[PDB]
Structure formats: structure tokens, C-alpha cells
Design a binder for these strands. Structure first.
Length: 157
RNA sequence: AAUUGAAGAGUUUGAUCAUGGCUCAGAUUGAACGCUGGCGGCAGGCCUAACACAUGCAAGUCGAACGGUAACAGGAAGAAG
């Protein structure tokens, strides 16, 4: 129903006097499949507790995304910490043409035809914040006609 | 009707985010090499020595331009078998 999807599991260290003590970080994205999407980071000492802590963070950080018939509205960009992400509406692009950690966030939002490309750093944590900054900044023709033109037949044409 | 088209990964660190190279997954070739090998179709086939070349062939034709008769096949005569 909410399409839980783990992206990456890492292994981080802390370096104490005894030695190095390890823990695990997860990155999971959830979403219904009609324009709601959220990621949660999560970290714990073992692997399945780190993924489960990511699931609880991802459910309470969902946003709203406007999509036209399972695809985007317009070409939009997204920037977060050296991760520049470009995305196209791809009018029947027929497939989520996106890279690692950019494909997974677009599968759970419900969007199906994107030509996407990630420039800069492709660190998996930062590119998920780059796409989510790109998707909620994207506006529908109903929102643009609500503030400009005052007619959806006059805004689009 | 005459284009509908854009994926990333590994590796600097105890771990991190950056920067930044290296490397890989793709397609292609007048290809070569190794192993293997049934048929057909359509193509392609000295990229190096514009190095050197045995032998054959690759530009002849026209008698309705002309003098002609070296052959060839007949004819016309002359003989004689």
C-alpha cells in the first residue's frame, strides 16, 4: 500500500579507545503511488533495526507531488549538496529512465515515464533530497492558473 | 506520418561530505588473434612497401575512305586426269 523500498545500507564507524565500533545506516523511501513520497534516514547498531527505523521516519515525512497521468508537469531541476538533478516529463517516455537512488524515489511516488539525469555528486543520500526538492517545487497547471492568467484554457492555450 | 528522447557503478577515509583523477557496464570496425564451426541470402575483402614484378589479358575498329591480294571459301576459264 505504501511501497517501502530500501535504497542503500552503509557501515559507519565511531573510533573509540578500545577500537572502532560499527553501526549501520539505511535509506528507505515510501509512497502510495499517486503523488505522495517521503524518505527517512535511520541508523542503528544492526541492519534490520536500521531499516525499520528508516521506515518510521519515512512515513512521517511525506510530501505532495502533482503528476499528470503518471508523469511530470514540466522539466524541473533539484539541487541539494552538490547533487544537481534534472528530470523531464517524458510524454510517454515508457519507463523510469533514472539512475541509482533517483529511480527508487520515482517508483514509489507513482510516476512512470521520466527521463532523468543526475549531475554533480551521486551520493545516494543527497540525490534523494535533490529529487524531492525538485518534485515539490514542481507546480501543476491548476496552481499556475490560480495565480496567473486566471483561466486554465488561457494559461496553457 | 516524417522522430517518443538523457540511468550509473567501483576506488582517497577509522568513518563522513565534497573535490578530483583512474577504471567498468554501451555502441561501433575494411579488423586481427584464440577456441569452435551446419546451411542460405545480401554485402565486404593489401588499412603495411606509391616496394619489386615472371606469365596471360585489360583498345580497338572501319573495305559503305583508298591502293590492293598474303591467306580463306567459291565462281569463271585453262588444262587433263
Amino acid at each position: 500500500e505504501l511501497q517501502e523500498k530500501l535504497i542503500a545500507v552503509n557501515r559507519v564507524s565511531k573510533t573509540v579507545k578500545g577500537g572502532r565500533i560499527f553501526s549501520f545506516t539505511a535509506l528507505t523511501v515510501v509512497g502510495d503511488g499517486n503523488g505522495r513520497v517521503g524518505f527517512g534516514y535511520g541508523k542503528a547498531r544492526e541492519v534490520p533495526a536500521a531499516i525499520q527505523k528508516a521506515m518510521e521516519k519515512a512515513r512521517r515525512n511525506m510530501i505532495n507531488v502533482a503528476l499528470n497521468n503518471g508523469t511530470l508537469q514540466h522539466p524541473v531541476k533539484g539541487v541539494h549538496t552538490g547533487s544537481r538533478v534534472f528530470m523531464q516529463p517524458a510524454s510517454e517516455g515508457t519507463g523510469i529512465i533514472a539512475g541509482g537512488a533517483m529511480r527508487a524515489v520515482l517508483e514509489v511516488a507513482g510516476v512512470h515515464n521520466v527521463l532523468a539525469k543526475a549531475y554533480g555528486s551521486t551520493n545516494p543520500i543527497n540525490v534523494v533530497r535533490a529529487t524531492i526538492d525538485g518534485l515539490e517545487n514542481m507546480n501543476s497547471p491548476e496552481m499556475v492558473a490560480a495565480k496567473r492568467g486566471k483561466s486554465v484554457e488561457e494559461i496553457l492555450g
